[PDB]
Design a protein around this ligand. Sequence first.
Ligand SMILES: O=[N+]([O-])c1ccc(O[C@@H]2OC[C@@H](O[C@@H]3OC[C@@H](O)[C@H](O)[C@H]3O)[C@H](O)[C@H]2O)cc1
Length: 427
Amino acid sequence: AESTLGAAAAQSGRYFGTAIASGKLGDSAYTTIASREFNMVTAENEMKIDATEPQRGQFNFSAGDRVYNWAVQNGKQVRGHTLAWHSQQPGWMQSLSGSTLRQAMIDHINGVMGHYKGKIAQWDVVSHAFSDDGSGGRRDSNLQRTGNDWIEVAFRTARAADPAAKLCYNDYNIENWTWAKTQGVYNMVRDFKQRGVPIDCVGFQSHFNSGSPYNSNFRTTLQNFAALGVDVAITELDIQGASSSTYAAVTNDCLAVSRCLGITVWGVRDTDSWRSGDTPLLFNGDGSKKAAYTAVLNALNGGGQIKGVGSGRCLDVPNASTTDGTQVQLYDCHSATNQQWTYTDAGELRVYGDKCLDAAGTGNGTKVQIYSCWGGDNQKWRLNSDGSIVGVQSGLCLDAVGGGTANGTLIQLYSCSNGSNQRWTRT
Ligand SMILES: O=[N+]([O-])c1ccc(O[C@@H]2OC[C@@H](O[C@@H]3OC[C@@H](O)[C@H](O)[C@H]3O)[C@H](O)[C@H]2O)cc1
């Protein structure tokens, strides 16, 4: 109830989910991670309009049901995505307009929700309905040109089709409270609640990058929407660079809002991401947990010198050398730059400013040394709550050779054993 993301989130009545791609369900490495870590699933594309209604009036749930069945059979709830929006519309719908388009939208909603009636926890009824031009208004689309009330109609339609599902409005770039787009959505939801329009949740995609960075005020945004009487959900979270601090910050924002139902990251491994170039998820392509994974898990579980517990001595660079390939050791702790390590958001343990704790391989006995920082996974580490420090690439623990405790004891990689020569404390 604390070793996996879903289980850790469940401790506070929340979920931690991911986007599942039906085309990857035959990949054992993929499903092993997905079934183990998440208790909520969103079909990445299988429940969209084009996927569910390829031809007007012709519904197809082959792909959607495969994802839905995999989710339920493996113990995960499901978020339906998405009933009505401008993107990925089938060819036939893109050419529709006015009343006929409005009716098509309604028929689609009834068809899809009817198929999954009572089996979906949340439905993204409408998505991407606002512009990014900075006006805070609706974006120009075929759906919007049929009447400004199309969104309201979609929700009223959805409520009737399946009263058991929570109905959400989902969008991106509505995380920062100071943005006009965020205000546009806020005003609409407030209007809906005041007039009784059936809406139960607001989904924040949370696709963060240096173009639209995460800001601490995201929590305020979540709290402001929660105050309107709707639940909130982080629906498609991914962070460019996967900063451990940022991932932990977003996790704590949801935990700080009683109405935040949970968090879904948009994909399992970076190689499965729609934005793989931004290495924005919690697992590497080879399936290894990233530093960000541990940061998130620690947050969900309610969680300078590096001193070894068994030895009482500090991780030290011999004679304050800055030479690449110098194996680190244990040494009496004292004020010195060669014992001052900085844990970065990328998961590095830096010394001297630009040298990185580096594993010279991946197996037991591998030498741990300092080497120029370059971003390799053999230079990334996960700081566990039990005091162990695990190498991302190797999955092995920082280990004081042979359990030595005296000055000069070298540091190596070794299968984690919870031994005192593998436990560290930082001050
Ligand atoms: O440019 N953006 O900021 C942006 C573009 C699209 C977008 O869509 C939302 O978030 C991602 C969507 O999923 C992807 O849709 C396209 C597929 O080819 C890809 O495989 C999916 O992962 C999601 O459905 C939608 O809600 C947001 C922001």
